[PDB]
């Protein structure tokens, strides 16, 4: 049996404020009694700017019914800072919010604001929690973006050690081993190996990265993520395409990894992005006529869904 907040002794002093939607508003929502009652008293709490424990409990009740209510989440964080509440306990509440399937843009941002204000000397415990939360959903965009912020924010504070970077690459390599088609993990590797300010750029690192890329392509020749990573890698470091062509030509039918003698089963040829590599390598050699023939085959035969795009690339050769 539901007990209205007007009959609760802890709220007898509060005069609720009704939602001012107008007499006959469009897109109205048939709220439950419990949700309308909590928002009626939240409007009164926010009107009097009350920072109290009962206001904190009320915000939790509301966000449990509507985790996307950004105004209530904003008010809740102001309650935590004003009352000097234990942000670690709130962080544990957000862990309980993940088990009960309560997530949104606001829940993830609330966790970010907590870590920012806590500012732990070592955020390794939060890093491990993010890794564990990615197991049910390995491609959660909010989680991957939050992991980028976590490492970026605390490395700015100098709190990410070299051993932490190393174990993070180990975890990223394991994620790609379980599913090499996880484009989110490929982007995370790009941060760890290329884009982050502390990344090493030497002849050994360029060789190691090119080996990992070619091995990933040889393992899954039709993995678009590996091909995009290869094209981005070569373009970012201004590396030529021709020296690596021996490892790509077998897919268009030396000192770097090569495809298997017999290609893996269920690998129909040619690979369209391998043809794009061949055409771009022809342009690198100023062989625009040979590149136009590859673009013409991509447009009319091997990648006809993008027939107009490859035709556009063919006309640019002239």
């Amino acid at each position: 049996t539901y007990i209205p907040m007007s009959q609760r002794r802890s709220w007898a002093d509060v005069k609720p404020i009704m939602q001012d939607d107008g007499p006959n508003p469009v897109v109205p929502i048939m709220y439950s009694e419990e949700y309308k009652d909590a928002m009626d008293y939240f409007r009164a709490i926010a009107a009097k700017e009350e920072k109290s424990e009962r206001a904190l409990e009320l915000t939790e009740i509301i966000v449990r019914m509507n985790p996307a209510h950004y105004t209530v989440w904003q008010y809740r964080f102001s309650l935590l800072t004003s009352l000097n509440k234990s942000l670690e306990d709130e962080l544990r509440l957000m862990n309980e919010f993940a088990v009960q399937n309560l997530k949104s843009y606001q829940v993830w941002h609330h966790r970010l604001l907590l870590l920012d204000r806590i500012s732990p000397q070592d955020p390794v415990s939060e890093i491990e929690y993010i890794h564990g939360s990615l197991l049910p959903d390995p491609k959660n965009y909010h989680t991957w973006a939050y992991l980028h912020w976590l490492y970026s924010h605390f490395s700015t504070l100098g709190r990410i050690s070299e051993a932490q970077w190393g174990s993070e690459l180990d975890w990223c390599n394991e994620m790609l081993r379980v599913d090499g088609r996880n484009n989110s993990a490929w982007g995370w590797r790009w941060y760890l190996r290329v884009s982050r300010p502390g990344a090493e750029t030497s002849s050994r690192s360029l060789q190691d990265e090119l080996i990992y890329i070619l091995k990933s392509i040889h393992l899954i020749p039709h993995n678009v993520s590996a091909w995009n990573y290869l094209r981005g890698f070569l373009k970012h470091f201004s590396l030529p395409l021709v020296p690596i062509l021996p490892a790509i030509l077998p897919y268009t039918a030396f000192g770097f990894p090569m495809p298997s003698d017999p290609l893996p089963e269920d690998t129909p040829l040619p690979v369209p992005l391998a043809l794009e590599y061949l055409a771009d390598s022809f342009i690198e050699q100023n062989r625009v006529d040979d590149a136009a023939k590859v673009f013409e085959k991509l447009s009319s035969e091997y990648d006809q869904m993008r027939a107009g795009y490859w035709e556009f690339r063919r006309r640019e050769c002239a």
Binding site: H69, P197, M305
Partner: protein, 486 residues
């Protein structure tokens, strides 16, 4: 006209190869390929002169979609409480879809739409996701409210446009409070920072004539740094200090954030500031865009991320970004001195065959077969369908004609900047900025002879505008009102 846009029914449908390497990504892709391919097999080819007996007809069920939007517009069940902070989006998704479907609202319903949205406007600036006495202002409902007022409002005393004009200073002050030094914006007080906020802010600022140099500082750099190695754009970029020493993208290239970044960058190119905006890799953005159109076995729909499933809502996000990316590429080729760049036919076939709810049901359009239709996917599917049906391009000759007719002596009061030197240098620079921003905002045209209506002219919907995603017949009177042009 369809020589380089082959029909899905005319191409061999083959699954994504496995390379004998199974994974969770391939499991969902193969299952999705089965669902979509089976639905196309049960549906008659839309390009057939007489529809096949025994198979489903793929004609756009506009009256079913109208009824779906109507019932979802006058009453939501309590189960959509998760959208209580997104009610302006429920309005926009409804009224823009009705505009696309060619269905008019009577004046009484328009007045209710205007009055409801004005209750969401805060006196201190900006719209919230709900009534001003319940929710704080937010950049995303501000876009949805401004665009909905462009669709349902008018220039009378009860039209709501005069209320937007009176709120220009407060809205601008709200925008400036959201601004970060690195060029990003929080979507609200204590909110997150991503390119959705930048896009929504730049659209509203463009429409209401409240763009100042202090509002745009570093905004171009934040967006440009969102571009990833794939060519698309991520949600945000991180500023590393030594204004910042460098900026790094924070996630994958994503169809929605690529659309917001391309549209934000395009809106910034109209601003006559020196060495502004910072350039992007347009060729890589165009390459990433066309690579997200699915194979024939998955209906030719667009996916939002590499190695993820096609989704009807990315017909607008990725498909609608294609004319923007194409124009940016054209400007680079012109500075350094034509078939469609995506399959306009296949995208329509995905919309008609796969994205539509099964006939005789609730109506509306959906993410994929097996997903319930909603107002968001209804609006984005139809918005992408409009882009596929109508060849859209940004015409320099139309922009030039707009410059020749612009009246710099007419306009609303200039915005007062927060910082003393945050405004334009002089009146010649401000009026030159108003002209270029107004002229380019009205520069999108539908090319004559480029129309492709798969399945017959009864499937034709109205023409939406790139970047803004409202009909041109709404955009022109709306932006002319706030710039005092006629």
């Amino acid at each position: 006209a369809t020589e380089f846009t082959p029909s899905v029914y005319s191409l061999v449908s083959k699954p994504l190869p496995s390379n004998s390497r199974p994974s969770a990504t391939l499991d969902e892709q193969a299952e999705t390929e089965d669902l979509i391919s089976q639905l196309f097999d049960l549906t008659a080819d839309p390009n057939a002169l007489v529809s096949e007996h025994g198979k489903r007809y793929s004609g756009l069920r506009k009256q079913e979609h109208t009824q779906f939007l109507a019932s979802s517009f006058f009453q939501l069940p309590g189960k959509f409480v998760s959208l209580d902070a997104s009610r302006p989006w429920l309005v926009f998704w409804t009224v823009h879809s009705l505009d696309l479907l060619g269905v008019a609202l009577d004046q009484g319903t328009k007045d209710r739409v205007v009055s409801t949205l004005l209750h969401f406007l805060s006196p201190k600036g900006g719209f919230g996701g709900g009534p001003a006495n319940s929710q704080i202002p937010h950049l995303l409902p501000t876009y949805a409210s401004v665009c909905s007022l462009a669709i349902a409002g008018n220039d009378s005393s009860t039209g709501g446009w005069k209320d937007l004009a009176a709120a220009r200073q407060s809205i601008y002050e709200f925008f400036m409070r959201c601004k970060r030094p690195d060029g990003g914006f929080v979507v609200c007080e204590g909110g997150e920072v991503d390119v959705r906020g930048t896009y929504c802010l730049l659209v509203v600022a463009t429409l209401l004539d409240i763009i100042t140099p202090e509002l745009l500082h570093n905004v171009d750099k934040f967006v440009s740094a969102c571009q990833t190695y794939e060519g698309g754009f991520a949600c945000a970029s991180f500023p590393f200090p030594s204004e910042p020493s460098c900026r790094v993208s924070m996630a994958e290239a994503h169809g929605g954030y690529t659309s917001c970044s391309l549209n934000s960058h395009f809106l910034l190119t109209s601003v006559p500031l020196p060495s502004f905006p910072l350039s992007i890799d347009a060729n890589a953005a165009l390459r990433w865009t066309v690579l997200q159109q699915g194979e024939p076995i998955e209906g030719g729909g667009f996916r939002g991320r590499t190695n993820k499933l096609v989704d009807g809502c990315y017909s607008w996000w990725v498909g609608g970004g294609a004319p923007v990316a194409e124009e940016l590429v054209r400007r680079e080729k012109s500075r350094k001195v034509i078939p469609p760049i995506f399959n306009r036919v296949a995208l329509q076939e995905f919309t008609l065959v796969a994205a539509q709810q099964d006939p005789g049901s609730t109506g509306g359009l959906r993410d994929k077969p097996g997903k319930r239709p909603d107002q968001y996917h209804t609006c984005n599917n139809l918005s992408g369908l409009s882009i596929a049906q109508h060849k859209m391009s940004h015409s320099p000759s139309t922009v030039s004609s707009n410059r020749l007719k612009f009246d710099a002596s007419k306009g609303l009061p200039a915005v007062k900047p927060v910082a003393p030197g945050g405004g334009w240098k002089n009146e010649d620079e401000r009026q030159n900025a108003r002209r270029e921003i107004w002229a380019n905002a009205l520069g999108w045209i539908e090319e004559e002879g480029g129309e492709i209506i798969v399945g017959g002219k009864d499937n034709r919907i109205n023409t939406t505008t790139p970047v803004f995603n409202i009909l041109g017949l709404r955009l022109k009177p709306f932006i002319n009102y706030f710039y005092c042009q006629e």
